[PDB]
């Protein structure tokens, strides 16, 4: 009789982690750090709503396609939401030069303010009310973009146009003008009368003439002609002058860039519900508490970092279930490691929070420190490209997948590598706890091989805990012990 | 007399791995996972042959340079093979607009079918048989591209051309046309007679006029004039119309994109031998059994992942060579760890496949699991760029080297890091095996310090293996043992 | 009496490293490998000075803006130094086509030699001395770019120009020409008299007409007109021909690319001091002895690798402070591990350089081997982009930050991971050293639990070191020992 056993915690936990060498091992304490859920809505970002283009495209909005809403309030936005194939773009066919680059400039701007530079009624020298077309219905009557004017000959004449705008604001200004390409030569004179025309624009930074390419093309929303648009940022103090003898499509309104910052053009077929998140994906929002998610690679806001995994669980606790050789003590709470009182007066299971506090520490200090090392992890950024930019487009994707594949690898093999060390730690602690016991009770005790000690003396409860504190003095029971040792020697 | 010794395997192996801390350490069992060989041929990919352009370039092929083969069979291809500096490109000098982007579109397409849109004999209004040139010999007589027609004035007139093609197929169609730039004004009238000409093309997505730039340049394959080509993809249901009053170079044949998928334009001076691989490099094929190779960074097919190393060896077995303290037991087969019978009846070397099966397991389960984590590793993709695209070209290469340098680093430091843990495992197993022995034979045995036990009792062969199974009961020999212990005490 | 104790080194060191699990742990021996200092000057690279543009831009230099220095010596350069917003660029306003790509070509070229192709006095057919302007003062009188000529009508006529240059040199040649865009039609005739003009250039590789876009723009350094420049590399054996009837701005001097290699255009507001480094950043030079620095991401030369850290310390030695259980022996020099002579004749502290030499080895062999694995680490490369290239610009930066964030992560978690293994090694060594002692002195000694042994016999100094060498024979003192053991048994 009279013993002591060194064991470890074990409990109702059934969550199970993986490591490099073994897989799905059951553990007691562990933390999942993958987010895999989303609410499937489109929401404001930390209070500020997205600009939702609805069925319109960025171009249809900026030009004022009769079908597209204007934002008369001049709001700021957390991000912009375009559908994947918007219905309302260039109602009048044509192309929009360096369009993809303009959108990119949107991504770093948060608030426009539409302002009027060339009032539609100030074109005393031409017809400003004819330039409309069936290709651009509004309320089922022919019409036209609202923010640029399709100036037409007046009383069979088209006086060469020179008009300037001196940008006297603090902000940069986005301005869009355009030029008309007719079907045939008859139509050219029919609208503008000068056989040969041009549209030239001048700033400090930007010199460009433009001339109408007359060619027969197929009908598109009613129209074999096309109209080509251009744009520039006119810096504060600079001015812009338009020269034309025809085909000029004049800006009425400019766009004041009043707040630049972080935004994006998110492509999603969702529409806004009354809902605010920290982190938004084109398929829903994200409850950004975990450090990792696998929901979508284009997320914006205060987001966890995206990895291509289906599982990511940190191990922090123990493996699940007399003597540590034979498994764990379900009968332990109030600690991770410890002992067992089998005494003249005893009954077991007091912990060694000496070493459990020192281990609950460096475990939670290691897992924090793990989230933190991917602070700088690759987040992906939206960009678009045209049908003659395929090479670059694929470049970009290889870059974004390239970094995701990398960080996903980092993410995994960090978890499993430290998982193995977390568990190698417990095995170490247990056998260490053992030793501080063994190396103080030395001649007075039997190494029962299970991981327990039988006493050649009597310990008692105050000397019992005197093994916890490393207190035990070999001498105070030395001579008592040496007697019974040499009885079992030559006894029984 | 009467003993037992705990030892580990050791054998004729001489393959040697590295780790972080020590280098070239000799081991017993290990697996090389670098491929470094190649057969130096160009082969089909899993049954399907490459399109081999021979001395021709992608342009010379697509336009039908008289020197280039046509593919009348309409085959599909695993990949396309261009030489590095092909001899047959634009036989007639000029430039090929957005050529580099066209090639990129090749890389994602597997099978053309040439079809005739504008039959050469249907140009009743012009001379279709004169447009040939010494710059384009076929059989040593002047000639010209085969898939586009160099329409010339007929009987000193050049009626303005309008011709359309409505694309009624399911597939996209690649079409190439072109415009002629003459030496001087005399030549312009000499061939097309209208002093001022244009070439305009119209689709839904594409509006472009083109006008001849008349300038004296140096002779190139006979010709100071140049000819500029263009191309577009005409989508199903769309149509295309060409307008010209001169210099038009008309398509005869279009190209039906009938199979898109994974392919590439591989630059190699090899030519095809009768040979099929899974993985092909521009210097030869690859016996894709290893997870890594260092042969070439542009490989295509079911390929191992390329790393810039010269060695990559996993350690899975032991280090090479009474008692484990002093090295390994060459005299062990049928296991990795185990013992030795030195008995009244004994002779040594029965294994502990208890722990060897449990370790041959997690070793082969770890090495599989290592190949798998680079499942998502960066493979590089061919792209070309023109002399005004250098920035992007270098961008791309920095990206591709950037990811290769990364994954090569991952690859190495995965091997060495787990190599060190594989070997730390064996040391652990050996000393653990020891303990399950020691902790059952306790008072009845002498800890000879070599890693062996001498018996204060007698064991015998059935109790012998009774240490393997953890079977041994201390009591059944306890009193027998305690006698001889206290004889060596106060004996001899 | 009569004992022996196994302990480890401990000393005045106070440098402290981190690992994954614990942080700032004090150690004895360690090596910092982060560089964080710089001298704040601009210096030659290994003997060869930078080309310092001063207040001029690459364009103002190459064109010979009257304000910019010429380099009459034809020097080679280690790298080029542009200020961030240079004062002297196009003194005459306009734009410089594919400028950003030209600069990139600078980065891979080390030495020009200006040579004269079209001598300014050889324009017998036009006015070569009028083409000057207030926009380009030199000594406060109107003037003009020095390396191109603003040819003007002579005696009210402008004979169509045809001039050629056959490039008969071995080197490539950079040539720049230009075309003038006037305010209005009156000015066009005023200078060149032909109402309609062109500027066409012909090489093997390059065919381009150019025509003056006449439009009113705002005054810039005096001038509402603009002038547009172009450039090409004319390969050896090729020729170039310029055709014009007006607005031609003719090259006088070409640039011989005579040494290509590694250089760069470094943007810095510093100016050169008399100073040479191996590694230069736009904020100063770098004492490139460490493997890592955090000074600046664009460094050039024989540079350490840049990481975004503030600390990077390798641990190689021990943790700081009878028996190893209780800390380290300040009283040890001449080794890392070892013992202590407490003997009939003894006094302690002789080392076990058996195992210290074997550990000082694999520690310095591991730290070298760590610097080496980032041999291939991502270094960043300068590139510039125009206001319509934003997408690509941001692509590039995401790429360069993307790889830096990665390698910074690698760098850190390599240090901390091996730091933990370096320290796990010492704990291992110490307890191992212990064992080679314990397993030879076995029955003759008391395992005092502190990590020391008391002798049931007497050892003496020659048997003392006989524990170092593993020499000790159990038998020579066995019978002497067994006597006193069985006295403490049944004694006192």
PDB file of C-alpha atoms in Angstrom, chain A residues 98 100-101 104 200 202-204 207-209 231 239 241 243 362 366 370 373-374 376 378-379 381 383-385 389 392 395-396 399-400 403 406-407 410 414 418 421 425 439 442-443 482 486, chain C residues 20-21 95 181 213-218 220 226 325 387-392 394-395 398-399 402-403 405-406 409-410 412-413 416-417 420-421 424 431 446-449 486 489-492:
ATOM      1  CA  UNK A  98      -9.318  53.030 -72.037  1.00  0.00           C
ATOM      2  CA  UNK A 100     -10.775  49.222 -68.229  1.00  0.00           C
ATOM      3  CA  UNK A 101      -8.305  51.764 -66.896  1.00  0.00           C
ATOM      4  CA  UNK A 104      -9.463  50.793 -62.101  1.00  0.00           C
ATOM      5  CA  UNK A 200      -9.518  67.899 -80.937  1.00  0.00           C
ATOM      6  CA  UNK A 202      -6.248  70.149 -75.433  1.00  0.00           C
ATOM      7  CA  UNK A 203      -4.811  70.143 -71.917  1.00  0.00           C
ATOM      8  CA  UNK A 204      -1.355  70.503 -70.458  1.00  0.00           C
ATOM      9  CA  UNK A 207      -3.204  66.548 -76.898  1.00  0.00           C
ATOM     10  CA  UNK A 208      -5.548  64.562 -79.164  1.00  0.00           C
ATOM     11  CA  UNK A 209      -7.234  65.126 -82.525  1.00  0.00           C
ATOM     12  CA  UNK A 231     -12.024  60.571 -71.020  1.00  0.00           C
ATOM     13  CA  UNK A 239      -7.935  73.850 -68.563  1.00  0.00           C
ATOM     14  CA  UNK A 241     -10.337  73.082 -74.906  1.00  0.00           C
ATOM     15  CA  UNK A 243     -12.112  72.061 -81.152  1.00  0.00           C
ATOM     16  CA  UNK A 362       2.932  29.482 -24.197  1.00  0.00           C
ATOM     17  CA  UNK A 366       1.913  30.658 -29.673  1.00  0.00           C
ATOM     18  CA  UNK A 370       0.518  32.448 -35.403  1.00  0.00           C
ATOM     19  CA  UNK A 373       2.548  36.200 -38.929  1.00  0.00           C
ATOM     20  CA  UNK A 374       0.074  36.288 -41.787  1.00  0.00           C
ATOM     21  CA  UNK A 376       1.004  40.605 -44.257  1.00  0.00           C
ATOM     22  CA  UNK A 378      -1.686  38.244 -49.904  1.00  0.00           C
ATOM     23  CA  UNK A 379      -5.158  39.631 -50.444  1.00  0.00           C
ATOM     24  CA  UNK A 381      -7.569  42.799 -55.938  1.00  0.00           C
ATOM     25  CA  UNK A 383      -9.039  44.083 -62.240  1.00  0.00           C
ATOM     26  CA  UNK A 384     -10.663  43.792 -65.671  1.00  0.00           C
ATOM     27  CA  UNK A 385      -9.172  43.443 -69.147  1.00  0.00           C
ATOM     28  CA  UNK A 389      -5.272  42.198 -73.255  1.00  0.00           C
ATOM     29  CA  UNK A 392      -1.859  40.463 -69.101  1.00  0.00           C
ATOM     30  CA  UNK A 395      -0.535  37.171 -65.994  1.00  0.00           C
ATOM     31  CA  UNK A 396      -2.642  38.758 -63.228  1.00  0.00           C
ATOM     32  CA  UNK A 399      -0.067  36.105 -59.926  1.00  0.00           C
ATOM     33  CA  UNK A 400      -3.185  36.010 -57.710  1.00  0.00           C
ATOM     34  CA  UNK A 403       0.217  33.915 -54.159  1.00  0.00           C
ATOM     35  CA  UNK A 406       1.611  29.853 -51.678  1.00  0.00           C
ATOM     36  CA  UNK A 407      -0.095  31.305 -48.610  1.00  0.00           C
ATOM     37  CA  UNK A 410       2.176  28.297 -45.610  1.00  0.00           C
ATOM     38  CA  UNK A 414       2.216  26.091 -40.207  1.00  0.00           C
ATOM     39  CA  UNK A 418       3.096  23.520 -34.740  1.00  0.00           C
ATOM     40  CA  UNK A 421       5.067  20.479 -31.491  1.00  0.00           C
ATOM     41  CA  UNK A 425       5.133  19.415 -25.722  1.00  0.00           C
ATOM     42  CA  UNK A 439      14.426  13.176  -8.514  1.00  0.00           C
ATOM     43  CA  UNK A 442      14.720   8.769  -4.651  1.00  0.00           C
ATOM     44  CA  UNK A 443      15.722   6.022  -2.271  1.00  0.00           C
ATOM     45  CA  UNK A 482      16.069   2.529   4.619  1.00  0.00           C
ATOM     46  CA  UNK A 486      16.095  -3.798   3.746  1.00  0.00           C
TER      47      UNK A 486
ATOM     48  CA  UNK C  20       7.602  30.282 -31.961  1.00  0.00           C
ATOM     49  CA  UNK C  21       6.379  29.462 -28.479  1.00  0.00           C
ATOM     50  CA  UNK C  95       4.901  63.993 -75.222  1.00  0.00           C
ATOM     51  CA  UNK C 181       2.052  70.172 -83.720  1.00  0.00           C
ATOM     52  CA  UNK C 213      -2.612  67.390 -85.236  1.00  0.00           C
ATOM     53  CA  UNK C 214      -3.467  71.120 -85.294  1.00  0.00           C
ATOM     54  CA  UNK C 215      -5.386  72.199 -82.173  1.00  0.00           C
ATOM     55  CA  UNK C 216      -5.499  75.012 -79.631  1.00  0.00           C
ATOM     56  CA  UNK C 217      -4.235  73.996 -76.185  1.00  0.00           C
ATOM     57  CA  UNK C 218      -3.174  75.952 -73.112  1.00  0.00           C
ATOM     58  CA  UNK C 220       2.945  75.512 -71.331  1.00  0.00           C
ATOM     59  CA  UNK C 226       3.198  70.738 -78.687  1.00  0.00           C
ATOM     60  CA  UNK C 325      18.700  20.894 -13.005  1.00  0.00           C
ATOM     61  CA  UNK C 387      -1.293  57.537 -66.324  1.00  0.00           C
ATOM     62  CA  UNK C 388      -3.028  55.073 -68.659  1.00  0.00           C
ATOM     63  CA  UNK C 389      -1.100  52.097 -67.367  1.00  0.00           C
ATOM     64  CA  UNK C 390      -2.361  52.127 -63.797  1.00  0.00           C
ATOM     65  CA  UNK C 391      -3.615  48.518 -63.822  1.00  0.00           C
ATOM     66  CA  UNK C 392      -0.223  47.152 -64.780  1.00  0.00           C
ATOM     67  CA  UNK C 394      -0.529  48.090 -59.518  1.00  0.00           C
ATOM     68  CA  UNK C 395      -0.028  44.568 -60.839  1.00  0.00           C
ATOM     69  CA  UNK C 398       1.313  43.646 -55.882  1.00  0.00           C
ATOM     70  CA  UNK C 399       3.879  41.293 -57.348  1.00  0.00           C
ATOM     71  CA  UNK C 402       3.671  39.926 -52.774  1.00  0.00           C
ATOM     72  CA  UNK C 403       7.082  38.342 -52.969  1.00  0.00           C
ATOM     73  CA  UNK C 405       5.703  39.635 -47.813  1.00  0.00           C
ATOM     74  CA  UNK C 406       6.391  36.009 -48.648  1.00  0.00           C
ATOM     75  CA  UNK C 409       7.563  35.379 -43.691  1.00  0.00           C
ATOM     76  CA  UNK C 410      10.017  32.656 -44.752  1.00  0.00           C
ATOM     77  CA  UNK C 412      11.176  35.068 -39.849  1.00  0.00           C
ATOM     78  CA  UNK C 413       9.765  31.580 -39.388  1.00  0.00           C
ATOM     79  CA  UNK C 416      12.360  31.123 -34.958  1.00  0.00           C
ATOM     80  CA  UNK C 417      11.885  27.562 -36.019  1.00  0.00           C
ATOM     81  CA  UNK C 420      13.742  26.516 -31.077  1.00  0.00           C
ATOM     82  CA  UNK C 421      15.726  23.544 -32.375  1.00  0.00           C
ATOM     83  CA  UNK C 424      16.151  22.005 -27.879  1.00  0.00           C
ATOM     84  CA  UNK C 431      21.072  15.430 -20.617  1.00  0.00           C
ATOM     85  CA  UNK C 446      24.405   7.654  -6.245  1.00  0.00           C
ATOM     86  CA  UNK C 447      21.987   9.474  -8.589  1.00  0.00           C
ATOM     87  CA  UNK C 448      21.669  12.574  -6.457  1.00  0.00           C
ATOM     88  CA  UNK C 449      18.694  13.828  -8.500  1.00  0.00           C
ATOM     89  CA  UNK C 486      26.031  -2.470   1.826  1.00  0.00           C
ATOM     90  CA  UNK C 489      22.656  -0.303   3.924  1.00  0.00           C
ATOM     91  CA  UNK C 490      22.417  -1.141   7.657  1.00  0.00           C
ATOM     92  CA  UNK C 491      24.741   1.616   8.812  1.00  0.00           C
ATOM     93  CA  UNK C 492      24.262   5.029  10.408  1.00  0.00           C
TER      94      UNK C 492
END
